[PDB]
């Protein structure tokens, strides 16, 4: 307890000696309280809103712009703990077969910050920051920590740049070298991209099995146990030398014994705990892959009880893993806490003992109620999307991503942060428009609104900011290259599920969902407000061009049949 975290608490105490006190009436019960000290934007994107007038009266769009971490998860039973250890050891070996753990560099970290002190850009350029990094790194090498403290604000657990670099240096390889790519992990989807997720679910559906299960865990990061953190730590067994010690330091000193600061009505509390995850992707994917294989084992009756595992059962588990483990991994699509599983049959639905005992209690369902599966891959939820099968005029088949259209419009109408110029606002509007042209072209209102935004924003202005922080986004729309060329590269040329590589010559060859399907997924097609908007779109485009000024514009509307 106090030995590993003491040095971090001491520094905070000395830094705030004047204010430092032990508040006897604090609201902590699961977190260890140490002391407290005294202490001290969802903006609308006007370009997008002006070009999406019918949605000004749609509440689901307009409303978008307008301490549940102090819980304890019971220690799993001895059998669950054996199941997790056997599975985690097996899974790290499968993952390491074709990959080599390595340290990530200052140059790679600098390359990241230079894309995505008052800024990380400022600190990374200053030699003194790297000297502070050196002092922290040398403490880690002898099993000590002084500055790796989380700053809470779901709750986002921030960290100082140097603590982030040390974490990235030791464990960045998991993401940088694609350990959870579908090729390497079989269940993983890291590096795939939203436009491949649909084809992966259709491939999973081709397997013989029961329904497709896609159970959400209620607050996954709070359900990460010490047992999970210890099982994830086993990746150090595949490392050597300096790398091995640095990674063991991140796990033991910053993950298994964290020091967190949080503002309370204004005091700053200094709390600690051995479990939970600060809200990485790779480690959540690993542990979810492990938890879902164990559920598959239970469904298949590999073991009878979680309370304890029989001498023979432990062998049966190891035999199951060597015999069918990889095939069972391939029945899954897992991205952190997001999962889709197509098990051997429907016994999985009621295989809930190990799942609940691991702490991965399902959301919006009673603890012992059997899961309700999906009978069609096109109905399955995955990473806030569902997927449609679209047949092109030429017979080729696209598998496209989709979500309720109000969510898409509501999000594009939001600008995050302060001090944006009209040019930066217009350029973020352009990033959303090009993202829609690439991913959601099949939605009538979005292809129209996207062409309107691209017609209203100066043609050579470069898309800015980001439309999403999703790890599934590859940002192909962040360019001034013609979007028909980008569409052909993404959907035809580089698409492995597309055998015929004939390019598309116009947007008119690119299909939409059926009109009724489009309305079902939130289209305003058929409404009077929408017909007026579509008919008078040049007027809305001109209003924005007039606000931006005397610039060079292109009319993208005639790429559509009606225009
Ligand atoms: C996570 O929680 C959030 C909460 C609020 C806001 C937001 S957000 O606006 O920042 N993002 C999303 O809502 C969102 C976006 C995507 C993608 C879009 C385009 C992609 C591609 C490609 C090809 O290169 S990927 C995605 O894809 C699965 C998943 C997403 O959400 C789960 C996120
Ligand atoms: Zn540290
Ligand atoms: Zn849809």
Residue numbers in the entry: 273 to 312, 318 to 343, 357 to 406, 419 to 455, 472 to 583, 588 to 601, 606 to 889
Task: Reproduce, without paraphrasing, sentences from the article in which this PDB structure was first reported.
DENV NS5 is a large protein of 900 amino acids composed of two domains with key enzymatic activities for viral RNA replication in the host cell and constitutes a prime target for the design of anti-viral inhibitors. A guanylyltransferase activity was also proposed for the N-terminal domain of NS5. Its C-terminal RdRp domain (residues 267–900) synthesizes the viral genomic RNA. DENV RdRp possesses a right hand-like architecture conserved across different polymerase families, with three subdomains termed ‘‘fingers”, ‘‘palm” and ‘‘thumb”. We performed a fragment-based screening by X-ray crystallography targeting the DENV NS5 polymerase and identified an allosteric binding pocket at the base of the thumb subdomain close to the enzyme active site.
Soaking of compound 27 in crystals of DENV2 (NGC strain) RdRp domain also generated the same binding mode, with the OH- moiety of the propargyl arm forming similar hydrogen bonds with residues K800 (backbone N) and E802 (carboxylic acid side chain), as H800 and Q802 in the DENV3 RdRp-29 co-crystal structure. Residues 800 (H) and 802 (Q) are conserved across DENV-1, -3 and -4 but not in DENV2. In the laboratory adapted DENV2 strain, NGC, these residues are respectively, K and E, whilst in the DENV2 clinical isolate, MY097-10340, they are T and E. Crystal structure of DENV2-NGC RdRp bound with 27 showed that the OH- moiety of the propargyl alcohol arm, made similar hydrogen bonds with residues K800 (backbone N) and E802 (carboxylic acid side chain), as H800 and Q802 in the DENV3 RdRp-27 co-crystal structure. Residue T800 in DENV2, MY097-10340, would also be expected to form the same interaction as H800 or K800. Two individual 29-resistant replicon clones harbored the same single nucleotide change in NS5 (GAA→GAC), resulting in E802D mutation (note that residue 802 is E in DENV2-NGC and Q in DENV3 used for structure determination). E802D mutation results in the shortening of the amino acid side-chain by one methyl group and is likely to disrupt this H-bond formation.
